[PDB]
């Protein structure tokens, strides 16, 4: 962890080249992600930008304060920052296999993830969330776009800008993933569990949480329909796998179903989610 010149980051990203492969790797609510090389190391550079006011500086310090000295197997690693130039920048260890969202959608012609790799990714993500909840942190934006994958497809939770240590007026997050109480402005770790429930649906189905062109448009409505015997999980299992067995899929769905209880107090805690995912692969 150290301070970077805005001009070093500007330089190694080809003046923040917004063309894909180019240097642009992705885009979120709070900025663009660029590929760069500093200190003999390939890095991800998030240039923060707005909705969000000067609150983007508050998410900048929030993430630095939370991640500056954090090391977990299943959390992304912050290498440093830049605040000496035009825009706020965060520099991370490069995740060569990008986001779970992008790998589930097979963006850029990447091969589909096997059920084996999907099970390991779910366990890792839950281990990442468990670490945060143990340290009395709430993520507030758990989704497939915020689960990154390293050179061994190890799951790394990312984007701690909205993380906290309760009601609020400023309601923020991705609505396709957000628990009902989180939409009303509640801040609780139980909201993170609900969101993880949706990530598990993405993993089982390979479908995005929201699709404008889909009936139904929200993936958590497909879950509701399965529970009302209007559909079966078997009909929605991702066709792009050869190694998926009914038992382990149905076991993961069971975890996702428990996570997606609309009443927060009925949902399992992260420790219970971890255990049920372990018994899935045993
Ligand atoms: C959304 O971000 C990324 C997208 C990417 N795409 N790729 C290419 C890729 O995945 N391919 C597969 C192999 O074949 C070529 C295509 C690597 C990517 C890496 C990305 N992110 C990070 O490395 C990273 C690390 C730490 C923290 C963060 C986030 O907090 C941030 F900053 F992005 F918001 N991101």
Curated annotation (Swiss-Prot):
<dbReference type="GO" id="GO:0038172">
    <property type="term" value="P:interleukin-33-mediated signaling pathway"/>
</dbReference>
<dbReference type="GO" id="GO:0002755">
    <property type="term" value="P:MyD88-dependent toll-like receptor signaling pathway"/>
</dbReference>
<dbReference type="GO" id="GO:0034142">
    <property type="term" value="P:toll-like receptor 4 signaling pathway"/>
</dbReference>
<dbReference type="GO" id="GO:0106310">
    <property type="term" value="F:protein serine kinase activity"/>
</dbReference>
<dbReference type="GO" id="GO:0043123">
    <property type="term" value="P:positive regulation of canonical NF-kappaB signal transduction"/>
</dbReference>
<keyword id="KW-0723">Serine/threonine-protein kinase</keyword>
<dbReference type="GO" id="GO:0048661">
    <property type="term" value="P:positive regulation of smooth muscle cell proliferation"/>
</dbReference>
<dbReference type="GO" id="GO:0016301">
    <property type="term" value="F:kinase activity"/>
</dbReference>
<keyword id="KW-0391">Immunity</keyword>
<dbReference type="GO" id="GO:0005737">
    <property type="term" value="C:cytoplasm"/>
</dbReference>
<keyword id="KW-0418">Kinase</keyword>
<comment type="similarity">
    <text>Belongs to the protein kinase superfamily. TKL Ser/Thr protein kinase family. Pelle subfamily.</text>
</comment>
<dbReference type="GO" id="GO:0007254">
    <property type="term" value="P:JNK cascade"/>
</dbReference>
<feature type="binding site">
    <location>
        <begin position="143"/>
        <end position="146"/>
    </location>
    <ligand>
        <name>ATP</name>
    </ligand>
</feature>
<keyword id="KW-0963">Cytoplasm</keyword>
<dbReference type="GO" id="GO:0005149">
    <property type="term" value="F:interleukin-1 receptor binding"/>
</dbReference>
<feature type="binding site">
    <location>
        <begin position="25"/>
        <end position="33"/>
    </location>
    <ligand>
        <name>ATP</name>
    </ligand>
</feature>
<feature type="modified residue" description="Phosphothreonine">
    <location>
        <position position="168"/>
    </location>
</feature>
<feature type="binding site">
    <location>
        <position position="159"/>
    </location>
    <ligand>
        <name>ATP</name>
    </ligand>
</feature>
<protein>
    <recommendedName>
        <fullName>Interleukin-1 receptor-associated kinase 4</fullName>
        <ecNumber>2.7.11.1</ecNumber>
    </recommendedName>
</protein>
<dbReference type="GO" id="GO:0004674">
    <property type="term" value="F:protein serine/threonine kinase activity"/>
</dbReference>
<dbReference type="GO" id="GO:0005615">
    <property type="term" value="C:extracellular space"/>
</dbReference>
<feature type="modified residue" description="Phosphoserine">
    <location>
        <position position="169"/>
    </location>
</feature>
<feature type="active site" description="Proton acceptor">
    <location>
        <position position="141"/>
    </location>
</feature>
<dbReference type="GO" id="GO:0008063">
    <property type="term" value="P:Toll signaling pathway"/>
</dbReference>
<keyword id="KW-0007">Acetylation</keyword>
<keyword id="KW-0067">ATP-binding</keyword>
<dbReference type="GO" id="GO:0005524">
    <property type="term" value="F:ATP binding"/>
</dbReference>
<keyword id="KW-0225">Disease variant</keyword>
<dbReference type="GO" id="GO:0009986">
    <property type="term" value="C:cell surface"/>
</dbReference>
<dbReference type="GO" id="GO:0035556">
    <property type="term" value="P:intracellular signal transduction"/>
</dbReference>
<keyword id="KW-0547">Nucleotide-binding</keyword>
<keyword id="KW-0399">Innate immunity</keyword>
<dbReference type="GO" id="GO:0019221">
    <property type="term" value="P:cytokine-mediated signaling pathway"/>
</dbReference>
<comment type="subunit">
    <text>Associates with MYD88 and IRAK2 to form a ternary complex called the Myddosome. Once phosphorylated, IRAK4 dissociates from the receptor complex and then associates with the TNF receptor-associated factor 6 (TRAF6), IRAK1, and PELI1; this intermediate complex is required for subsequent NF-kappa-B activation. Direct binding of SMAD6 to PELI1 prevents complex formation and hence negatively regulates IL1R-TLR signaling and eventually NF-kappa-B-mediated gene expression. Interacts with IL1RL1. Interacts (when phosphorylated) with IRAK1. May interact (when phosphorylated) with IRAK3.</text>
</comment>
<keyword id="KW-0597">Phosphoprotein</keyword>
<dbReference type="GO" id="GO:0031663">
    <property type="term" value="P:lipopolysaccharide-mediated signaling pathway"/>
</dbReference>
<dbReference type="GO" id="GO:0002446">
    <property type="term" value="P:neutrophil mediated immunity"/>
</dbReference>
<dbReference type="GO" id="GO:0045087">
    <property type="term" value="P:innate immune response"/>
</dbReference>
<keyword id="KW-0808">Transferase</keyword>
<feature type="binding site">
    <location>
        <position position="46"/>
    </location>
    <ligand>
        <name>ATP</name>
    </ligand>
</feature>
<dbReference type="GO" id="GO:0034162">
    <property type="term" value="P:toll-like receptor 9 signaling pathway"/>
</dbReference>
């Amino acid at each position: 962890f150290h301070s970077f010149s805005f001009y070093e980051l500007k330089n190694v990203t080809n003046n923040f080249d917004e063309r894909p492969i180019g240097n642009k790797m992705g885009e979120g609510g709070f900025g663009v992600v660029y590929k760069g090389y500093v200190n003999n190391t390939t890095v991800a550079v998030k240039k923060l930008a707005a909705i969000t006011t000067e609150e983007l500086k508050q998410q900048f310090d929030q993430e630095i304060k939370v991640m500056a000295k954090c090391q977990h197997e299943n959390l992304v690693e912050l290498l440093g920052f830049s605040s000496d130039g035009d825009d706020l920048c965060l520099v991370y260890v490069y995740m060569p296999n990008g986001s779970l969202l992008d790998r589930l959608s097979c963006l850029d012609g990447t091969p589909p993830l096997s059920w084996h790799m999907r099970c390991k990714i779910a366990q890792g993500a839950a281990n990442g969330i468990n670490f945060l909840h143990e340290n009395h942190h709430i993520h507030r934006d758990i989704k497939s776009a915020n689960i990154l994958l390293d050179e061994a497809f190890t799951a790394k939770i990312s984007d701690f800008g909205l993380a906290r240590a309760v009601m609020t007026s400023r309601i923020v997050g991705t609505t396709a993933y957000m628990a009902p109480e989180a939409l009303r402005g509640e801040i609780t770790p139980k909201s993170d569990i609900y969101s993880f429930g949706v990530v598990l649906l993405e993993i089982i189905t390979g479908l995005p949480a929201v699709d404008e062109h889909r009936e139904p448009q929200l993936l958590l409505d497909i879950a509701a329909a399965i529970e009302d015997e209007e559909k079966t999980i078997e009909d929605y299992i991702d066709k792009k796998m050869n190694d998926a067995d009914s038992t382990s899929v149905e076991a993961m769905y069971s975890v996702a179903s428990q996570c997606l209880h609309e009443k927060k107090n009925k949902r399992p805690d992260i420790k219970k989610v971890q255990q049920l995912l372990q018994e899935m692969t045993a």
